[PDB]
Design a protein around this ligand. Structure first.
Ligand code: NI
Length: 341
């Protein structure tokens, strides 16, 4: 059964609610982005209207084989009427195709559902600037002050310089980058660009990348592994055993691997600056964990919410424990008292 924080009161609408069977009263199912925890339940047999971005739509059709007659793509930054209700989709600064949804309720209430997002000050100049929001359904993944990490730009700078240094010293080194979902594609695209290489990958991952509307993509990626010195592998294979095994397969073309595991936050963020990050190393294999986040840090979240001044906040992440819920409510009250709304 569908939890309360996935329902939009005063509408026939749900958000990210595909794992519950047929939801009573739901005339339109919204999908914020193509991450498995959120799409869980969709398939080629789904027969209710799905509303989403163009990119999310490409992935539903090609990867999950949802039939085309049930896919309803909407442009961003554009007022649209769905089942008699005005909605807008906004870029969430999460993974490709990820949106926030603004719902203009018939009674005058305005609701923002952030989906998953990485708050940015650029959002303060979107169509959010123009009016008041009564209810915020908020991505609270990192809602605690211990959660700090660098900008995505600093993280990419570190990776480009690390990869370019290693391969310039040793032209026979291979770079490997882990992946398990869409998102974070800047990591491997920036590295391959500095090395003058295409990114090599499996046919399944190439297919996913072809759904994402990335400009000039055919120039950037390939399924011919032997022509490429940046390879993508599943995240689970980014360990000394999996990488040893991969180096065997390359037929004595390479004699060193430098690998990247993009993670979210890890507790080594509580002590170590990005510049100071060092790898784990065994023989001719080195593995870097890099804190590339597609979710708000604590300070980015705080800034966004203090700017928006919602009347009520409903968390969508870390809602399963009393301790989490209590912690989160304390911070919302601080933010409100500090800013005066
Ligand atoms: Ni996500």
């Amino acid at each position: 059964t569908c939890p309360f924080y996935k329902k939009i009161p005063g509408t026939g609408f749900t958000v990210d609610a595909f794992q519950y069977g047929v939801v009573e009263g739901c005339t339109a199912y919204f999908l914020t982005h193509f991450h498995s925890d959120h799409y869980a339940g969709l398939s080629k047999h789904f027969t209710f209207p799905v509303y989403c971005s163009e990119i999310t739509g490409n992935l539903l059709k090609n990867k999950l084989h949802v039939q085309e007659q049930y896919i309803h793509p909407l442009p961003l930054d554009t007022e649209c009427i769905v089942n008699g209700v005005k909605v807008v989709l906004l870029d969430a600064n999460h993974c490709p195709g990820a949106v926030m949804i603004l719902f203009y309720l018939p009674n005058g209430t305005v609701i923002l559902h952030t989906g998953d997002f990485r708050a940015d000050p650029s959002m303060e100049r979107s169509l959010l600037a123009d009016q008041k929001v009564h209810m915020l359904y908020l991505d609270t993944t990192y809602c605690s002050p211990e959660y700090t990490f660098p900008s995505q730009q600093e993280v990419i700078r570190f990776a480009i310089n690390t990869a370019f240094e290693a391969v310039t010293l040793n032209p026979h080194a291979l770079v490997v980058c882990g992946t398990y979902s869409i998102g974070k594609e800047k990591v491997f695209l920036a590295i391959a660009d500095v090395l003058g290489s295409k990114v090599g990958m499996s046919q399944e991952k190439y297919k996913t990348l072809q759904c994402l509307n990335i400009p000039e993509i055919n120039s950037l990626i390939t399924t011919d592994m032997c022509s490429s010195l940046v390879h993508l592998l599943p995240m689970m294979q980014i360990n000394f055993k999996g990488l040893q095994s991969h180096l065997k397969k390359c037929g004595g073309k390479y004699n060193q691997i430098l690998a990247f595991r993009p993670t979210g936050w890890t507790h080594s963020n509580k002590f170590t600056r990005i510049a100071d990050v060092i790898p784990q190393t065994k023989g001719n294999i080195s593995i870097y964990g890099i804190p590339y986040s597609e979710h708000s840090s604590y300070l980015e979240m705080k800034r966004f919410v203090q700017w928006l001044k919602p009347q009520k906040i409903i968390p969508t992440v870390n809602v399963g424990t009393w301790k989490s819920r209590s912690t989160m409510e304390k911070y919302f009250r601080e933010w409100k008292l500090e800013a005066g709304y």
